[PDB]
Amino acid sequence: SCIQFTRHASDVLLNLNRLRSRDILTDVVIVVSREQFRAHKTVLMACSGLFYSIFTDQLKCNLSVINLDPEINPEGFCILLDFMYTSRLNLREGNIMAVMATAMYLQMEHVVDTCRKFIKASE
Amino acid sequence: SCIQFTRHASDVLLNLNRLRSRDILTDVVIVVSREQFRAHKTVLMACSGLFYSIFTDQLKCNLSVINLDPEINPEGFCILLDFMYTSRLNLREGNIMAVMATAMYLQMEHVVDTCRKFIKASE
């Protein structure tokens, strides 16, 4: 018999992004080919199968620095980190291959799906 | 020129609630008249003006235990904590007064608004 507030999840995510932009309560640095990205472990886990696996590991859960595979493109990661905190994906002809490869590595199934679809339309 | 995934914010919140239910990466205990509630500081801040003020304070941001005012009802808090992580509010004739008072103290404006409206309909 609950009532539901339609905009609640969006408002929560908007506030989480405001905390990220002001570097409030960020608890991890993600290193991508020397570029550094500060974030909240819980948000990374909520969006990515890879971060979910990493931060549920009894040793890795306590790390303040995570280094990604050197093949990972920093711009592709940045676009995906922005998507995690906003639901918005900056998908462009020039970045789609790097975004899809990064989303496959991060295990972000819905992003991988839209990249496959946009690539298929161009062929 | 971004594309947007409609269900992303809801899916993020659902995963944050899964982490709460399994007590994963919870970083604070909220004490309400001896009852204890584990949660994520970032989610509490994203939902409540009171928690936002508390965890942006340079001293309180580091506390692992927060004690609420003794007038706060533990059931009212529990219903609001559930709403924070699900967008669903269990509003009932028997709890509406405790839920509204707790939402006013926690500074959860949309919850206060629906409580005022439901009370006005019954008068």
Partner: peptide, 4 residues
């Protein structure tokens, strides 16, 4: 607010 809605009935979910």
């Amino acid at each position: 607010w809605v009935i979910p």
